[PDB]
Scaffold this active site. Structure first.
Site, PDB file in Angstrom:
ATOM      1  N   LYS A  87      43.095  70.039  55.729  1.00  0.00           N
ATOM      2  CA  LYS A  87      43.799  70.308  56.977  1.00  0.00           C
ATOM      3  C   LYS A  87      42.989  71.254  57.848  1.00  0.00           C
ATOM      4  O   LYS A  87      42.940  71.099  59.076  1.00  0.00           O
ATOM      5  CB  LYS A  87      45.181  70.907  56.704  1.00  0.00           C
ATOM      6  CG  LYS A  87      45.928  70.281  55.554  1.00  0.00           C
ATOM      7  CD  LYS A  87      47.222  71.029  55.238  1.00  0.00           C
ATOM      8  CE  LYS A  87      47.676  70.734  53.789  1.00  0.00           C
ATOM      9  NZ  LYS A  87      48.038  69.304  53.599  1.00  0.00           N
ATOM     10  N   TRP A 114      53.261  64.064  46.902  1.00  0.00           N
ATOM     11  CA  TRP A 114      53.273  65.097  47.929  1.00  0.00           C
ATOM     12  C   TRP A 114      52.200  64.865  48.977  1.00  0.00           C
ATOM     13  O   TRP A 114      52.413  65.168  50.150  1.00  0.00           O
ATOM     14  CB  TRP A 114      53.049  66.467  47.259  1.00  0.00           C
ATOM     15  CG  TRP A 114      53.559  67.724  47.977  1.00  0.00           C
ATOM     16  CD1 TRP A 114      52.824  68.820  48.323  1.00  0.00           C
ATOM     17  CD2 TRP A 114      54.913  68.014  48.369  1.00  0.00           C
ATOM     18  NE1 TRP A 114      53.626  69.770  48.908  1.00  0.00           N
ATOM     19  CE2 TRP A 114      54.913  69.305  48.948  1.00  0.00           C
ATOM     20  CE3 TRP A 114      56.121  67.302  48.305  1.00  0.00           C
ATOM     21  CZ2 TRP A 114      56.075  69.899  49.455  1.00  0.00           C
ATOM     22  CZ3 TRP A 114      57.272  67.900  48.769  1.00  0.00           C
ATOM     23  CH2 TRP A 114      57.239  69.174  49.362  1.00  0.00           C
ATOM     24  N   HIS A 135      43.169  65.344  41.800  1.00  0.00           N
ATOM     25  CA  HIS A 135      43.174  65.979  43.114  1.00  0.00           C
ATOM     26  C   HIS A 135      41.862  66.718  43.367  1.00  0.00           C
ATOM     27  O   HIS A 135      41.388  67.486  42.521  1.00  0.00           O
ATOM     28  CB  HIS A 135      44.366  66.933  43.231  1.00  0.00           C
ATOM     29  CG  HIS A 135      44.920  67.035  44.620  1.00  0.00           C
ATOM     30  ND1 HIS A 135      44.804  68.176  45.393  1.00  0.00           N
ATOM     31  CD2 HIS A 135      45.587  66.131  45.376  1.00  0.00           C
ATOM     32  CE1 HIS A 135      45.375  67.961  46.565  1.00  0.00           C
ATOM     33  NE2 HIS A 135      45.853  66.728  46.580  1.00  0.00           N
ATOM     34  N   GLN A 139      55.328  65.590  51.162  1.00  0.00           N
ATOM     35  CA  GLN A 139      55.524  66.894  51.787  1.00  0.00           C
ATOM     36  C   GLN A 139      56.034  66.723  53.217  1.00  0.00           C
ATOM     37  O   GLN A 139      55.365  66.099  54.050  1.00  0.00           O
ATOM     38  CB  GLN A 139      54.223  67.712  51.798  1.00  0.00           C
ATOM     39  CG  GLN A 139      54.432  69.044  52.523  1.00  0.00           C
ATOM     40  CD  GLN A 139      53.317  70.065  52.350  1.00  0.00           C
ATOM     41  OE1 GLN A 139      52.135  69.727  52.255  1.00  0.00           O
ATOM     42  NE2 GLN A 139      53.700  71.334  52.313  1.00  0.00           N
ATOM     43  N   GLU A 192      54.380  76.463  54.607  1.00  0.00           N
ATOM     44  CA  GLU A 192      53.390  76.855  53.619  1.00  0.00           C
ATOM     45  C   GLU A 192      52.165  77.487  54.273  1.00  0.00           C
ATOM     46  O   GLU A 192      51.736  77.078  55.358  1.00  0.00           O
ATOM     47  CB  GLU A 192      52.979  75.638  52.788  1.00  0.00           C
ATOM     48  CG  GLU A 192      51.898  75.962  51.778  1.00  0.00           C
ATOM     49  CD  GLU A 192      51.580  74.830  50.818  1.00  0.00           C
ATOM     50  OE1 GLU A 192      52.223  73.762  50.895  1.00  0.00           O
ATOM     51  OE2 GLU A 192      50.682  75.025  49.971  1.00  0.00           O
ATOM     52  N   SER A 237      42.321  69.357  50.547  1.00  0.00           N
ATOM     53  CA  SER A 237      43.706  69.833  50.437  1.00  0.00           C
ATOM     54  C   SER A 237      43.991  70.775  51.606  1.00  0.00           C
ATOM     55  O   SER A 237      43.840  70.350  52.769  1.00  0.00           O
ATOM     56  CB  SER A 237      43.897  70.421  49.035  1.00  0.00           C
ATOM     57  OG  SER A 237      45.270  70.627  48.751  1.00  0.00           O
TER      58      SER A 237
END
Ligand SMILES: [Zn+2]
Ligand SMILES: [Zn+2]
Length: 378
Positions: free
Chosen positions: A190, A286, A322, A234, A242, A186
């Site tokens: 990134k 998302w 997730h 997203q 964010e 998540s």
């Protein structure tokens, strides 16, 4: 054995605007010439990173004045001297080594989110709490040393780079710095992509469900959101806001993704030709099922061109929660860690997606209008 080769390469003009609804060409040098040799990738890779630092992440501070490491009580403490002051952080270590051991570095504070996929692999585990360097609230030790408006993601890449610095001169930690992996899910997927992209000493990059700002095409996300009539995936602005992940200017691309001089296949290409295993989900709206898949498919061109097709896998399996990795992807994790960390051969290199919830139809003709060159050996 080197963090990067940025100082060996001349970085030319970096445009901030183009007009290109297709994916930008990753083989096109800043000097306007397409690369022809695999030797040209050393510097082409630095040019892409410099573009990301200027346009999305912010400048990665390089060549710190001094990095000191000390290992005591299963914890490695890294003291960095730079810009008139000092900053310190520590990472927990499991397993050890005279006989150094390969290691997986994971965001946490769990160590990453691969779960039982690593069980039975005699590797060390290093937990990195990114709040020690740059919390998403702002502030942090990083911004005690530096103040050029960077985002938090490039501060984490800096952090992991200082871990490797301290490791290289702390053998009592018992870790083989030549066999290091990075992982996280998540927001930390990134983070993992950028970490492995900006430190060449990461021999295996495993970004998990990295989503937007990660290995997901900005243009495809904006397309999906237009097809739905709403922010299904997203969007660029949201990923540019964010968690203070990106520099404050990046969200200004939001209504105009076709002006981006890059897309996220080029961040993936910064990892090439080093091993890279992308673990994606599906059915997460998302997260961006289609733009992540299309980034996975599009990114193969650079690995193919360098002759490293065996070192890149995109694996998408949906139908699960997730950041809870399904047993169907344990073989991927084990195969890459055995191959690139423990010296045991395995069949690798694959583009695989199952249990999708959207129509997957990646047509190279829609997204790629540049030829993939045949890069020559020197
Ligand atoms: Zn290099
Ligand atoms: Zn599998």
């Amino acid at each position: 054995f080197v963090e990067d080769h940025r100082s060996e390469c001349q970085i030319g003009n970096i445009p901030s605007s183009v007009n290109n609804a297709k994916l930008p060409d990753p083989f096109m040098g800043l000097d306007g010439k397409r690369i022809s040799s695999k030797a040209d990738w050393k510097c082409r890779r630095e040019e892409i990173g410099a573009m990301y630092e200027k346009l999305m992440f912010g400048t990665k501070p390089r060549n710190p004045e001094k990095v000191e490491g000390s290992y005591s009580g299963g914890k490695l403490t890294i003291k960095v001297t730079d810009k008139g002051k000092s900053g310190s952080f520590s990472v927990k270590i499991s397993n050890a080594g005279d006989k150094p051991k390969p290691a997986m570095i994971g965001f946490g504070g769990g160590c990453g989110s691969l779960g039982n996929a690593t069980n039975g692999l005699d590797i060390a585990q290093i937990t990195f709490n990114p709040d020690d360097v740059a919390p998403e609230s702002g502030g942090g030790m990083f911004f005690q040393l530096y103040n050029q408006g960077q985002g938090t993601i490039i501060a984490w890449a800096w952090g992991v780079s200082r871990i490797i610095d301290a490791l290289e001169k702390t053998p009592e930690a018992g870790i083989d710095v030549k066999h290091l992996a990075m992982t996280g899910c998540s927001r930390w997927g990134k983070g993992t992509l950028a970490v492995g992209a900006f430190d060449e000493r990461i021999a295996l990059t495993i970004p998990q469900e990295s989503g937007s700002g990660g290995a997901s095409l900005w243009r495809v996300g904006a397309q999906v959101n237009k097809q739905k009539g709403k922010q299904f995936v997203q969007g660029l602005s949201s990923a540019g806001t964010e968690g203070k992940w990106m520099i404050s200017s990046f969200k200004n691309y939001d209504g105009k993704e076709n002006t981006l001089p890059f897309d996220q296949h080029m961040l993936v290409a910064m990892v090439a030709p080093r091993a890279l295993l992308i673990l994606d989900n599906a059915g997460q709206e998302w997260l961006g099922e289609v733009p992540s898949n299309y980034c996975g498919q599009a990114s193969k061109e650079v690995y193919d061109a360098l002759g490293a097709t065996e070192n890149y896998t995109y694996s998408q399996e949906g139908g699960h929660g997730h950041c809870q990795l399904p047993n169907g992807q344990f073989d991927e994790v084990k195969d890459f860690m055995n191959k690139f960390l423990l010296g045991k051969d395995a069949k690798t290199g694959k583009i695989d997606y199952t249990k999708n919830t959207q129509t997957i139809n990646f047509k190279k003709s829609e997204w790629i209008d540049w030829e993939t060159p045949s890069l020559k050996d020197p």
